[PDB]
Amino acid sequence: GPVCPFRCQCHLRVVQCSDLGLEKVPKDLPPDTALLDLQNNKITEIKDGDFKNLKNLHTLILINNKISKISPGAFAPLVKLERLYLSKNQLKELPEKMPKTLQELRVHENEITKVRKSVFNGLNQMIVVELGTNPLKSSGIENGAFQGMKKLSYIRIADTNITTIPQGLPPSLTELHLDGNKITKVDAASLKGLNNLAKLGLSFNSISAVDNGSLANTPHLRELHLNNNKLVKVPGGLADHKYIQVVYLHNNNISAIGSNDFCPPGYNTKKASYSGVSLFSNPVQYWEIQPSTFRCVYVRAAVQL
């Protein structure tokens, strides 16, 4: 006989237990539960028995609890789990042995200091990972830690203590968001192999330089946000890059702008047209840029000086 905990609402394969101050995961829940919402409670840990007989559960929300420890494989019995939301908790590290069906993991606002490559081995259905707002440091991220996710399309590590782009990122990535960290430079090695990367967010960091060859490793990149950093000049490779269309560089320390910083010498029919370029809040003024600098842009609205 399955029971709905007192105060929780159990309707249509949805078990709603938010805002109840629960101190641990309820048991004896309906075997067919598809979505379990345990948000805003006082759960301190996930024990090995906590999720038994929840074989149809595709979504688990544990956002805003006080979780400081999760037994290895505690989520394993959730053979159909696609979304796991552990944001706003007190995790010290990511949970080991998670369902191989997992498509999205969010562990925003925790106390992560180490990202073991082992937690991600085999998770081949994973497409989105959000690990922002953690005291994590670049040293805490094992190299190739995310390599195991052959389908990963999006990853975001924001407002943490990392200082360099993680090495060994899965080549399936289309979006890499590292806004609001403490990155100081962009090395070509970290972006090596990201042939599918379309968006690269590096805004609000402390970047002072972008090695030549960097953007060339992301040949199909369409959006580059580097605003609010410490750049002394526009990153190189924009003129010979063929797919870049959006380049945000406002709020930096760019001294001057070369004639071929964005457009190549002769018109290149193969280079995609720029749809947006931002340069305001920089030392350079509109009067220090030769009108020829944006000769490959055919919309005045695009360039914002």
Residues 114-143 that bind a copy of itself (CB under 8 A): 127-128, 130, 132-133
What residues contact residue 2 under an 8 Å CB cut-off, 6+ apart?
A: 28, 29, 30, 31
Residues 158-217 that bind ligand NAG (CB under 6 A): 160-161, 212
Partner whose binding site includes residue 93, from a copy of itself, ligand NAG, none (CB under 5 to 8 Å by kind): none
Dist. CA 305–CA 287, nearest whole Å: 10
Which member of 17, 156, 160, 217 binds a copy of itself (CB under 8 A)?
A: 156
Residue 182 is a binding residue for a copy of itself (CB under 8 A) = no
Residue 253 is a binding residue for a copy of itself (CB under 8 A) = no
Dist. CA 192–CA 142, nearest whole Å: 17
Long-range contacts of 118-121 (CB under 8 A, 24+ apart): 119/93, 119/94, 119/95, 120/145, 120/146, 120/147, 120/148, 120/149, 121/148
**What one-letter code names the amino acid at 88?**
K
Which member of 68, 167, 196, 253 binds ligand NAG (CB under 6 A)?
A: 253
> How many residues in the chain?
305
Binding window for ligand NAG (CB under 6 A); candidates: 101-109, 114-122, 230-238, 292-300: 230-238
Partner whose binding site includes residue 128, from ligand NAG, a copy of itself, none (CB under 5 to 8 Å by kind): a copy of itself
Residue 230 is a binding residue for ligand NAG (CB under 6 A) = yes
Cβ(117)–Cβ(94) under 8 Å? no
- The three-state secondary structure class of 294 is helix
Binding window for ligand NAG (CB under 6 A); candidates: 54-62, 95-103, 188-196, 229-237: 229-237
Residue 90 is a binding residue for a copy of itself (CB under 8 A) = no
For ligand NAG, the binding residues (CB under 6 A) are: 135, 160-161, 212, 230, 232, 236, 253, 255
